[PDB]
Each structure stands twice: as structure tokens, then as C-alpha cells.
Symmetry: C3
Subunit: 256 residues, 3 copies
């Protein structure tokens, strides 16, 4: 059966808090090679895709494929009961329609057991057309969160622009317009703190800001975020979950 031991359940909790408000319910596709979760929000504008490889877990055992359509809100409500440093064991019996979340303690006298009731979800795996992006900005996740949360105060549409000497996020609204421009750092004191712009052609796109703000709730997962995009192709916000996988949000451009 599905028996996975995660040493630090903070990763799982942060993942659930990153997916909680974008998508209500998702189909965790468990396999012998890892865990996947590909689903698009209720408005069909953005598509979140999570992958957690097997080697990131301590003892990941899966003999048969599973599709556990968990309710993400309830799953996060259960995950909240776990501690910050707890070892989390996910156990899905061969076929039981319940997922056992076992929150052990950091080698202490507390063990918590929860049996989250699954629900049957009509699995659908839409094809993600592999594509080559013209601009790849790599920036500290704090800066992107700040930029989106700031320009959200002005307008609801961010115009992202990739030149060669720096990327600029513009926005406009009733109270004026404002544009934040970042230049690529040359003396990277910390490889985290750098802003690296792999540019192959200057691009300019427009995106909604509700969805970028929904994306930036995954900032505790990784320090660096990768904004990869090209013309007439949904932007790709990528957060690398350290040595165990990634969390990748796709967002379709805005009309006009």
C-alpha cells in the first residue's frame, strides 16, 4: 500500500497551504515513482502542477498506482494539527477510501492519528504542451512576492517585461501607475540573492494579479522563484521544493 514517511512535515504543510486557496479539491496521483498533482483552478485560467519525487521521502513504498481525490481544504485543516517539526507518515491502504495521516513527534511522547475521508474525483490529466520560453528570470522569492503584493495595490493587471538589462513589472489603475524594474545582479554575494535573466528575445505580457498573489503563497517553500515565459504562452512560476521536487504554476495571459 501507499506508505510514505516525510521527516519534516513542514514541507507537506507548506505545499497544502500553497495549493489550498488556488484549487479546492485535487486528485493526488500516487505512483511508484513519486507523487503528482496536476489540476487547474475553478476558473480554468491557471494550472498548478506539483511533483514530489520518491527519493525525498525516508521510506516511500507504493506497489499499486493510486488516485486519491482529497479535498485540499480539509487536508490542510488536518495538516494544521501537525506540529512544525513532526515526522508525517501518509498511509493509504490498497483500497480503503481513507488516508491515514500520522503525525509523530520529534522523538517524544505524542503521536497523532487522523483518518481523512477521501472523495471520488473524476481524474483528468490535460496535456501540458512542452515549449521553449524566450525569457527566464530567476529571482529571490521574497522580491517577487513583494512585487506582486505591492503592484496589487495599484492595478489588477501586471505587465511583465523582459529586456536584457532587467525585467520590469508595470501596473496602472485609478490612483496612477507604477513600475518596478529589477536589474540582473553582477556580483552575486549569495546565489539566492541574485537575479539572473536568461533572455533570448525581449518579451512583454500582461497577467492578472489575483493569480500571481495565489502563486506567491508558496514562498516559504523555496527562496528562489523562476519566472519563465515567452510570447503567447502561459507564464510559469516555479518553486523548487528542496531535493524532493517542485511546484509549478501556469498562468494564461490577459486579453487586451
Amino acid at each position: 500500500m501507499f506508505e510514505a514517511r516525510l521527516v519534516q512535515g513542514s514541507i507537506l504543510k507548506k505545499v497544502l497551504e500553497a495549493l489550498k486557496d488556488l484549487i479546492n479539491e485535487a486528485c493526488w496521483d500516487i505512483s511508484s515513482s513519486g507523487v503528482n498533482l496536476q489540476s487547474m483552478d475553478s476558473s480554468h485560467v491557471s494550472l498548478v502542477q506539483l511533483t514530489l519525487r520518491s527519493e525525498g521521502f525516508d521510506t516511500y513504498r507504493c506497489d499499486r498506482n493510486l488516485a486519491m481525490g482529497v479535498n485540499l481544504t480539509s487536508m490542510s485543516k488536518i495538516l494544521k494539527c501537525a506540529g512544525n517539526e513532526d515526522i508525517i507518515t501518509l498511509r493509504a491502504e490498497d483500497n480503503a477510501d481513507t488516508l491515514a495521516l500520522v503525525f509523530e513527534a520529534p522523538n517524544q511522547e505524542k503521536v497523532s492519528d487522523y483518518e481523512m475521508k477521501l472523495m471520488d474525483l473524476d481524474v483528468e490529466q490535460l496535456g501540458i504542451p512542452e515549449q521553449e520560453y524566450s525569457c527566464v528570470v530567476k529571482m529571490p522569492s521574497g522580491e517577487f512576492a513583494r512585487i506582486c503584493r505591492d503592484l496589487s495595490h495599484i492595478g489588477d493587471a501586471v505587465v511583465i517585461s523582459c529586456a536584457k538589462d532587467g525585467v520590469k513589472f508595470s501596473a496602472s489603475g485609478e490612483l496612477g501607475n507604477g513600475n518596478i524594474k529589477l536589474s540582473q545582479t553582477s556580483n552575486v554575494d549569495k546565489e539566492e540573492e541574485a537575479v539572473t535573466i536568461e533572455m533570448n528575445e525581449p518579451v512583454q505580457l500582461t497577467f492578472a494579479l489575483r493569480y500571481l498573489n495565489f502563486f506567491t503563497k508558496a514562498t516559504p517553500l523555496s527562496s528562489t522563484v523562476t519566472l519563465s515565459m515567452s510570447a503567447d504562452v502561459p507564464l510559469v512560476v516555479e518553486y523548487k521544493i528542496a531535493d524532493m521536487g517542485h511546484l509549478k504554476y501556469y498562468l494564461a495571459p490577459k486579453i487586451e
Copy 2:
């Protein structure tokens, strides 16, 4: 006249921060032994009783056994106006219906006064039967509040069970079921060590709403004591800092 000077006045604040949501209006029974407060909740379900000994306050004087009727909401509102390191003096009069509590600041020359209107409430208090509970469970109040708040996200009723080497909280609801087992610390770190005294097994079901109401007294004492005798209103007891104790009695549901 009742005149009571208390050095660590913040204590009083926390006390009313644990009752203002259970008990709208109470009757402080004041005597030379100290302060007492006994009541049912606002819906006559669970009981609360508070004892503060006269040896706890810095100075105490009570020339006659009086029944000060106080609206706990307004008194908590007033006590919010008292700094943390303040000196509260509840200079009540002999019979006037204006309790007079002064917030002295230490060497800050911020003498503050407050004259709170009393209530002419004379409601009688039922005698609290005292029995030898056989489910003694001393556990850190932080962890107990954690457990209650956690199980509150699953269901409305908690099933508490005790065994010679542990205590199991359980709950159920449409989101699933949850079980927190907690075993007695086997001589593993006297300060936060959980301890269980059981002569027989016991298992009950309590409404989590009132358990969450009780947990608000967590800042009072770091360690809470639980007691449950099969058909006996469970008691949770927080020991105030060598001044008295606060106790909630919760009737198990059937």
C-alpha cells in the same frame, strides 16, 4: 472595608481573561480567608470556581464577609487599562456599589484610579461535592490547549480515555476522525513531564466548545490537572501562582 493590595497585578487580568466569556456576571464572595467565585456558565452547563487566598495578595483587609456583585465584562474592560507590571489595589468600600480599583505604576508616578459600578446580584451558589477522582492527569497546559484546539477542527465532541500508561483524546466528524495519544513522560525532562494516576480505566465524551472555553486560562499555570471519575463532571484545575486555584467542572454528555 475590603482593601486588597496585590503586587503581581497582572495575575488578576489573566483571571478575568478566562471568565469574561463564560461568566457574564459573578458574585465575588469576599472574606478574611480571601476571595471566592462560584457560578455556572451563561447557559447553566458547566461550573467554574475560583479561590484566591488572602495570603496571596500583598496586603489584605476585610472587615466583614461581603458579596460584591460584579459584571465580569466591564471589570475585564477596566483591567485592560492596567499595565503589565502594575500594582492593583481593590479598595472596596463597606457597602457602596462602586468598586474602587487603583493601578499604581512602580515609581512611574502614573497613579490611576477606576470606580466600577457594581451589581446588586445576590444569587446563591450550590455546594460543590468533593470526591476522590481516580483519573489524575497532570499535563502541560500548552499541550492540552493544543490538543483541544486541534480536535476542534475535526468534530464537536471529544472522547477522552485513560490507561495505566497514557491518555487518548479522540474525535470524529465529516472530515474524518482524529486520535492523539499521549503517554506519561518516562523520566524524560519535572517541568513539562506528563503524569497519570489511574486505579481503573475511564472514558467519557465532552463538548469541545467548553473545553476550548476552559483552555483560555492557559497563561495562568503552565501545568493543568485533569480528573475524571466515570459518571462525575470532569474537573480541570489550573493552579495560580501560590495564590489559589481555578477549576472548571464539565458535565460529560450522554
Copy 3:
């Protein structure tokens, strides 16, 4: 063109979160001497006067005396986009319709240039004369903020009595009564917390607590607040700025019978 670069950026932030709830839209009078702002509350009960001298700005350049109306809520919403370490550069053309605020991060390549939209304000400068107040109480700001926030729980009117021995705030509400007497402090080491009551005649006034709580929103500006007060003239709550100017709040007394 008016261009003013200020390295201590946080000041602006704080000032705007000091006014944005008392005043809704104001008229910044920029001149070669500095920036002034006289603005009356919408209910004609409270007035605010801000002054930022040009010698406090790291770089100041004003050619013609501007008078730009701004929507202090929009300006606060724009300034909330600046970190507490940014260098803030205000810039406006001869008679432009917009005000460009450039927040430059101190040690990064992040430069954010917003462009606020001014409004049309036709305000008249009230003439406030230099007075010699009867009672001047210089106390720590946090102290006054605590006093007002505490008395707001009791009742919605504070009676300030400035006697000889010390000031005394009082309030009475449906749940009781309270009064904080505040005695003058001694010549003890720290200077900021030394209460200093200089009085000439014992005065007693009655003020609204809503506006006093609006005043205390400027406590992060400075550590010492100065309450000037005389008979039948508005209370003057003054907060200095860090050697740049000041921010005074005039509150008018209640109606006495």
C-alpha cells in the same frame, strides 16, 4: 520643477500613516523653504499642520511655489509600496497633474517609480497665531498613547485638568469612571521619559477621545509629545520630527455649559 530626495525614507511613510485616517485629502504647499500642510478635518473639529523644512531633505529643489492637492489615502497606498530603507524622491513638474515618487532600494538594483495622480483642492490657509499657552506638558509619546487608548475604554470624552502639581486626565462612562493623574518627573538620567509640566493658570478642558486616538497615530514619529493648552483655545498636540520639522494637531474643546 520640485524635486526632493529624502534618504530617511521611513519618515514620509510614518507621516502619511499619521494623517491618512484623520485627513482624507490635503494640499501640500511646497516652497523653497520646505513643505507645509495645513488641513482641517472634514467635521471642522480638528486641524493638522505638518512642516518639513528644506534643510531636512537630503536634496531639495523648488523653483515656483507649488500647491498640490493629494488624496492622502492614495498617497498612503502608494507609500506602502516602499521598504523602510528606501530613499524616497518626490518630483513634480511646473504645474503637472501627477507626482512621481521614486523609491530606491539602498543596496540593490530595485528602483520603483510610482506616479500618483493629484486632485483639485481649493483650500484657504487658516490663520493660526503664535500663542503663549497656559499649560505645557511635555511627556513621552508612548505614555500619552497609552493614556488615551485606556480612557477610550471608559468613556468618549476626556477632561484634562492641568493643575499646579500635575496633569490629570479623566473620563466617565456607563461602566464607571476613571482618572489618570500624572505627576511631574524628577531630574533622573533618561531625558525622554521626564514629564515636564509648565503651567501658569490651572486650566480644565473637555476633548473628544476619537480625535485624540487619531492624534496618537503619530507616536513612531518622536518619543516626546507636547500638549499645549489654554482656556477656550484648541489643544495643541505637537510631535517633533527627527530634526526636519514638526506635526501639530489642534483639537477643539467640547461645548461647555
